[PDB]
Design a protein around this ligand. Structure first.
Ligand SMILES: *[C@@H](C)[C@H]1/C(=C/c2[nH]c(/C=C3N=C(/C=C4\NC(=O)C(CC)=C4C)C(C)=C\3CCC(=O)O)c(CCC(=O)O)c2C)NC(=O)[C@@H]1C
Ligand SMILES: *[C@@H](C)[C@H]1/C(=C/c2[nH]c(/C=C3N=C(/C=C4\NC(=O)C(CC)=C4C)C(C)=C\3CCC(=O)O)c(CCC(=O)O)c2C)NC(=O)[C@@H]1C
Ligand SMILES: *[C@H](C)[C@H]1/C(=C/c2[nH]c(/C=C3N=C(/C=C4\NC(=O)C(CC)=C4C)C(C)=C\3CCC(=O)O)c(CCC(=O)O)c2C)NC(=O)[C@@H]1C
Ligand SMILES: *[C@H](C)[C@H]1/C(=C/c2[nH]c(/C=C3N=C(/C=C4\NC(=O)C(CC)=C4C)C(C)=C\3CCC(=O)O)c(CCC(=O)O)c2C)NC(=O)[C@@H]1C
Ligand SMILES: *[C@H](C)[C@H]1/C(=C/c2[nH]c(/C=C3N=C(/C=C4\NC(=O)C(CC)=C4C)C(C)=C\3CCC(=O)O)c(CCC(=O)O)c2C)NC(=O)[C@@H]1C
Ligand SMILES: *[C@H](C)[C@H]1/C(=C/c2[nH]c(/C=C3N=C(/C=C4\NC(=O)C(CC)=C4C)C(C)=C\3CCC(=O)O)c(CCC(=O)O)c2C)NC(=O)[C@@H]1C
Lengths: 169, 36, 160, 155, 160, 161, 160, 161, 161, 161, 160
């Protein structure tokens, strides 16, 4: 994987450039926001399972057919598979928030999702909808918490949505 | 002898229910009820 | 990056980030300011550091610059200095990242094979990096010199 | 063949079995208003207190339990029941009473036994499959397999 | 401890510990004083903490003490309180070690089937861990509580 | 491509032989089955669009595939899915008339799985739609013509899978 | 968006954005606040605009809910209203983005082929879109009603 | 893989209801044919080597396939063709006893075309061999079970085509 | 290609719901940046040729690339290199206006790596040239607009990597 | 391995003799008791977790091994011990269904004693847990099945000893 | 045996026997009395079966008994009759076990190379097993002879 520091290092190494003033500024910005990143990661670590449960317990009401027959969460086996996928999404969002980079989000989540989900018949729309619901819950929880900076939290879930979604337009 | 005629015989046709709107369109169903 | 290592260690067990790894991340983020100070000193002194280290190397090991040596000739000397600059830049990357992973990935994987192919004494290259370490540690405080010494020593070990 | 007659009979009065389970389990009204032997400590559930959506979920789940019991009897193995029941208790306890579910399942088993009661070779299988269902439902949700990453490369 | 994690990673890579790992070990050695302080404060204030946690948990879960529960006998109620004491002891051990390894190897791995074999509800026990962590945080100071909280949070994660 | 007659002719040709007794027997069998094949082809041609309509209705209407975010949500995506089903129906009819599945490989299956993989299309869902197409065709075609059409549609499903 | 259309045309002609195109983008970025206002108004009247438009459409074309019609039964009428809502949402997206392309790529391209398979009257759907347009004009100011009516009329023309 | 039982239950569950009127019809037909199909499978298992012997004698032996330059020329290729014939017979038995060719799809037709095209196996020769296998099995087991196995054998043949 | 506006609307439509408050937040942010984006675009459009001239003078001219035996030696290859620099600047302008590199992924970085590989184009030289273009553009357009443009220029460079 | 029938066959075969009267009536007894063995095995498999739970509850709950310092204290060690007990139960069920005790030496008693000695596992407590499993299974299945199960359980305990 | 195979499969799958496997075990146990009767008939008619099979084999394949073969005088014929009796006893063991496991374990593996070493034609031994099959089938009732044939033909195929 590559965090923000690693990706900036790779970018400058590509042209064989020493770390210039803009590179130092971006590094300083990441290093100053690291406290808020760690705080948000601690919060999501504390409330991970409950957040995923709430996300599903809103998503299945948004899309009732995912628990009705022929939906892809019908069984308890299917329901646990859906919960495992959403927990995967939350864990990788935590990882991406601490890393300040979506490279992990691509390397270990998105690089085969459409292949796997199409192979299993699993819908790729309700998945991103549940991801966005998780992001909204996370943002509300962080805003309630004493987090001075919270704009970065929307980045990983938004990248998940953009990469795993269908190109409607 | 003819009891083994499971697949070679005439297949037993099944019934597939036509798909119908579900709870994801409850708002529109209620809108239709009130537009009645 | 320490962030990379901690996130990878967490994912290898499939858990969220452990308290110890979060502690390590917080320490890394706090020390980032000193990291950038060291890195900026290194990049600002890149010309002087490389020049002085090259002079020290060409004095201690005149064989490499004498005729029949790998660095003999104006172009070969310039290329040796350019390699010194490359390793100084990798040192800066490691300083900023708080580890030696960028140095490993860019300029310490297969370096032995590459320098064998080019005909260079890997011990001479390690000596050049050691002199770069000495010159750079002469240009900063005690703690910062000890901090950069870790990356310099890592390069020395990987080369020899 | 016998499994087929078992399935046909249970499907024949699935409504009756679920109704007689629901009336026994829930108190304060008619559980069948909007349908879609060893009671440990349970308390009957008020229909109005439980609410429309929750009661709908519970009724659907009871009928579904009967439906997979018939499916498993037809298939011949309790694998479907085990896979769909071994973890359901935890996911259900959050807003659904395990005691009420247990008494409803026992009611279903007793109803099936009394209604069919044909022969041990024809009824002991039904008894076995309800017993496997109850054991799986009483079992707490097991821990997950964890394929640890071999190294830093692999998640 | 973090020393164990660093040395294990170095052994796995067949190499010496890196600069970042060494600095993390140094930081943990520095923070050992506050680790110790965690140790004595928890050890000497367990009893009120455990009593408050048990009373709050059983108020939220009026089943285990109630009929149809799990702790009818005084032998079972004492067992639940003993489990609180053991969990908080493990939390102190983990905080002193700096990472989650003592908790993982003493009361985390396999604990789900541990309490399935005894019919203790895992959600009930995770709620008990939540209330115990809340009591410990309330009884500890703000920065002290912030340092101690992640270990309890990780225990909650592993439980469910 | 090649029908059954073409297959027997090509086998005899490649062996450099005249049509022997076995080739005559195979040709006679195809000639026996020919009128039923023509009847089924005419029926399916009469009811082409309808069969696809009820196929999707039993399979993909009011589903996650046709919800927003699915691969069939947009009007253009739905038209593309309908076009795929129209090709599948027409080519299964052609294969049934020819008595051979070689036409499917020549036209449809030679690159179609790579096509759907590059398109992101769900092979499981498309197989479900084709499976529904099987019964919707069987209803209008009969029993043994239904079996033949189902065989060619199963070939399509195996190629996609 | 209007930016996307200008970029596409400029790329097609292999040239930078025209000064007039840049001026149009400038005006659009300035009027973004107003267009967001219209979008919010439509989103507020979402559950009433489509309802009233369906009222008018059913009273104008009784065959739709009459026996044999495409939308006979409450379920089919609800599906008709869901298409109603989909078109209004497309109009919202189009007015927000300043371009009809998000409208066309979701609910205009191949729509006749998509609705032939469903047996629905394209002219009926166009009349429905018309009725939605009058409902919006009623629940909208004067000028912004014209601005949204441009996109409504585009949808109407491309569908009917 | 799957069988008729699981296919019926899957259809029933996806429709959401119990096994009402035709699921049990198909299930009772399957159970009725079960004993005869099991006896046929036992006979085929006992006669496995023989059936391959008469099939190869009828179709492949004394042909350009076996002669030099043929894909069944060398001893290793002869053994591979015989092993493939045993594979076809075994998976025909599996499909017969499971009531569905989904085992054929997942285990036989998943990469059959790829492997055979990559190797160079004559598709027509393999189809003739499988037809000979079907005829030998039908003769050795009876017309009824012969046809019952022949449906899956012909499914494999069509997949090869 | 997807700009910021179409990206937000896409994220909305794949969810099926209208633009909530967050969507309007993103749209207002994009419109706020729009004036700076348009100013930078107009300045770059006016100074199109001059920027490429300065970049070529800074990086490639009087080098082995432009001397005999270099891929920028022949007049036709010089003109092609200049046209490529024009492509990079224009598509950087497009990405700047749209707030995304989607157009870069669709058109610029779409087969570019192996295109240059087949043609023999020096990847490091072209990357250095793109960096010179970025530097000149930043100097000519300002610190903030220069950084914003350099984001897309660096995206192109890293893609070429 | 072997079972009752296999063991009697081997006993006759070592002398190379046909099945005499003793082998005949031993086979008669095994066939008669097969129904009882099947019933007991079915009951044990149906309630398998309960036997281990009750056996540990009446054997090592609130015990020194569960106390810290013992080999049963930690959650990981407790899970390993319960897994060992469950596998011992399953192997006892296999032995009872077989009618022969060689399976235990075949799969279990090869190295469990020495591996527990290497790990410092208390063999006496292991034997006590095995005995408690004996009473639990005897109570759950019946005295007739209880003695038959306890024969192999005692074999396991003696081998571990 | 069926029970042996069930236990082996259960171990390989790591679980107890399924209800269907228990059903097949029960059916095998019920049919055990019938199969034991079958073996009783075979062992009652063992001597005559071997004698008739041997003389029929000698008549049908004179090469084995004629000069140049393995049947010379009385000793070679007696050894062949001993082998034939061994195979008849193995078939009886298979009949009582309900599975060809005892036959395979005692002798079915390496028989090819053993007869190759001794010069015995495996085709001839398979033929002799065949005549044993017809003689036994004639000596027993038709439906009874079905299972005896189902084992004899397995032996013949393995010895082909
Ligand atoms: C004396 C040689 C023995 C004998 C021979 C025999 N062989 C066949 C038939 C075939 N023999 C082969 C063998 C090979 N083909 C190859 O390409 C190779 C390597 C070069 C070998 C070893 C094959 C393939 C056949 C099949 C027939 C065909 O060629 O198409 C027969 C006829 C068997 C029958 O019933 O058809 C015979 C008689 N027979 C004996 O008894 C001698 C011990
Ligand atoms: C008669 C069968 C034709 C024929 C056969 C032939 N096959 C091969 C090689 C292979 N066949 C397979 C096929 C399968 N293996 C499986 O496991 C399955 C499902 C159970 C199938 C369908 C495979 C995989 C191989 C290669 C690997 C292997 O050894 O199994 C050959 C050899 C080709 C070669 O030259 O290497 C041959 C000759 N040949 C004919 O002429 C008949 C038409
Ligand atoms: C409570 C006394 C009764 C009850 C109510 C109830 N259930 C849910 C939610 C779920 N129930 C199920 C059911 C099943 N899963 C299966 O695999 C099968 C067959 C074995 C069944 C019947 C599932 C999957 C869910 C979750 C998805 C859903 O919404 O259906 C709720 C809602 C809980 C919540 O809102 O969070 C309620 C109130 N279920 C019972 O079994 C009792 C009889
Ligand atoms: C209402 C004004 C008219 C009408 C509507 C009607 N539509 C359907 C079914 C569908 N309509 C669509 C259309 C779209 N889906 C999209 O995603 C888009 C853009 C966002 C459009 C335009 C689709 C795809 C369907 C299929 C149903 C499904 O999704 O499952 C019906 C019912 C069809 C049926 O068979 O049930 C109806 C009635 N009918 C009229 O008569 C009105 C003029
Ligand atoms: C002199 C008659 C005119 C003139 C010349 C001039 N040229 C340059 C710079 C370059 N000229 C070329 C041209 C070519 N390179 C080739 O390989 C060929 C084809 C075989 C041609 C025609 C190139 C590539 C350059 C770039 C510089 C470089 O060589 O690296 C200059 C200098 C421009 C500057 O400012 O650097 C000049 C002056 N100028 C006139 O006014 C005369 C009419
Ligand atoms: C109290 C919070 C909950 C509860 C407690 C409860 N526990 C038991 C039995 C045991 N608990 C343990 C504990 C541990 N095992 C380990 O390996 C570790 C980690 C280091 C711990 C803390 C053990 C060993 C047992 C069994 C052996 C023993 O007690 O010595 C019971 C007994 C249940 C019964 O007797 O049926 C109970 C009740 N019960 C609740 O409801 C609370 C949620």
């Amino acid at each position: 994987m590559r965090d923000a520091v690693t990706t900036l290092i790779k970018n400058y190494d590509l042209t064989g450039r020493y770390l210039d003033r803009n590179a130092m500024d971006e590094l300083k910005a990441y290093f100053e926001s690291g406290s808020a990143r760690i705080a948000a990661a601690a919060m999501i670590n504390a409330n991970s399972a409950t957040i995923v449960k709430r996300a599903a317990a809103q998503l299945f009401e948004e899309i009732p057919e995912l628990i009705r027959p022929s939906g892809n969460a019908y069984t308890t086996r299917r329901f646990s598979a859906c919960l495992r996928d959403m927990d995967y999404y939350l864990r990788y969002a935590s990882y991406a928030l601490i890393a300040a980079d979506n490279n992990v989000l691509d390397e270990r989540v998105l690089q085969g999702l459409r292949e796997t989900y199409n192979s299993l018949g699993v819908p790729i729309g309700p998945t991103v909808r549940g991801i966005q619901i998780m992001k909204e819950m996370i943002e509300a929880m962080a805003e309630d918490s004493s987090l001075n900076s919270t704009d970065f939290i929307a980045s990983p879930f938004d990248h998940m949505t953009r990469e795993l979604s269908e190109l409607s337009v | 002898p003819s009891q083994v005629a499971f697949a070679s015989g005439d297949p037993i046709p099944q019934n597939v229910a036509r798909r119908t709107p579900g709870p994801s369109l409850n708002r529109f169903k209620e809108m239709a009820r009130q537009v009645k | 990056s320490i962030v990379t290592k901690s996130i990878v260690n967490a994912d290898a067990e499939a858990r969220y980030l452990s308290p110890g790894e979060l502690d390590r991340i917080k320490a890394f983020v706090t020390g980032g300011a000193a990291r950038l100070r060291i890195a900026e000193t290194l990049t600002g002194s890149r010309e002087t550091i490389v020049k002085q280290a090259g002079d020290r190397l060409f004095q201690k090991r005149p064989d490499i610059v004498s005729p029949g040596g790998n660095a003999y000739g104006e172009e070969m000397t310039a290329t040796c200095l350019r390699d010194m600059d490359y390793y100084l830049r990798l040192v800066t990357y490691g300083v900023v990242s708080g580890d030696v992973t960028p140095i490993e990935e860019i300029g310490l994987v297969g370096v032995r094979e590459m320098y064998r192919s080019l005909g260079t004494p890997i011990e001479a290259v390690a000596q050049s990096v050691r002199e770069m370490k000495e010159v750079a540690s002469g240009l900063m405080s005690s703690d910062d010199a000890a901090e950069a010494s870790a990356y310099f020593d890592f390069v020395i070990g990987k080369m020899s | 063949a016998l499994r087929l007659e078992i399935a046909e009979t249970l499907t024949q009065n699935a409504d009756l079995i679920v109704s007689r389970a629901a009336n026994r389990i829930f108190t304060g009204g008619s559980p069948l208003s909007y349908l879609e032997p060893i009671p440990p400590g349970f308390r009957p559930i008020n229909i109005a207190r439980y609410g429309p959506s929750n009661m709908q979920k519970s009724l659907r789940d009871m009928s579904w339990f009967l439906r997979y019991t018939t499916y498993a009897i037809v298939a011949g193995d309790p694998n479907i029941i085990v896979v769909n029941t071994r973890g359901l208790k935890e996911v259900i306890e959050n807003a659904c009473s395990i005691d009420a579910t247990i008494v409803a399942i026992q009611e279903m088993r007793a109803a099936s036994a009394d209604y069919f009661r044909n022969n041990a070779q024809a009824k002991e299988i039904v008894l076995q499959y309800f017993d496997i269902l109850l054991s799986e439902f009483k079992a707490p949700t097991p821990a997950n397999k964890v394929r640890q990453g071999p190294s830093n490369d692999i998640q | 401890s973090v020393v164990s994690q660093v040395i294990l990673q170095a052994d796995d890579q067949l190499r010496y510990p890196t600069s970042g790992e060494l600095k993390g070990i140094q930081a943990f050695l520095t923070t050992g004083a506050q680790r110790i302080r965690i140790a004595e404060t928890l050890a000497e204030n367990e009893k009120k903490i455990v009593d408050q946690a048990q009373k709050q948990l059983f108020k939220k879960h009026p089943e285990y003490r109630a009929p149809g529960g799990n702790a009818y006998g005084q032998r079972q109620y004492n067992q639940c309180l003993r489990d609180y004491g053991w969990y908080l002891r493990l939390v102190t051990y983990g905080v002193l070690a700096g990472n989650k390894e003592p908790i993982e190897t003493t009361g985390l791995i396999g604990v789900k089937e541990m309490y399935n074999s005894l019919n203790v509800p895992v959600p009930g026990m995770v709620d008990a861990v939540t209330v115990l962590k809340d009591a410990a945080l309330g009884l500890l100071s703000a920065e002290d509580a912030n340092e101690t909280a992640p270990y309890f949070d990780y225990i909650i994660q592993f439980m469910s | 491509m090649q029908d059954a007659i073409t297959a027997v002719i090509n086998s005899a040709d490649v062996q450099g032989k005249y049509l022997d007794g076995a080739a005559m027997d195979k040709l006679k069998s195809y000639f026996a089955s020919g009128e039923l094949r023509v009847r089924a082809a005419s029926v399916i041609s009469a009811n082409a669009a309808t069969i696809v309509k009820e196929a999707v209705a039993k399979s993909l209407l009011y589903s996650d595939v046709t919800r927003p975010g699915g691969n069939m949500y947009t009007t253009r995506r739905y038209a593309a899915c309908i076009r795929d089903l129209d090709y599948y129906l027409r080519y299964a009819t052609y294969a049934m008339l020819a008595g051979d599945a070689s036409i499917l490989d020549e036209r449809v299956l030679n690159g179609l799985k790579e096509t759907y993989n590059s398109l992101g299309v769900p092979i499981s869902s498309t197989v479900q739609a084709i499976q529904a197409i099987k019964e919707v065709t069987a209803s209008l075609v009969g029993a043994d013509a239904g079996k033949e059409m189902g065989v060619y549609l199963d070939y399509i499903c195996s190629g996609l899978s």
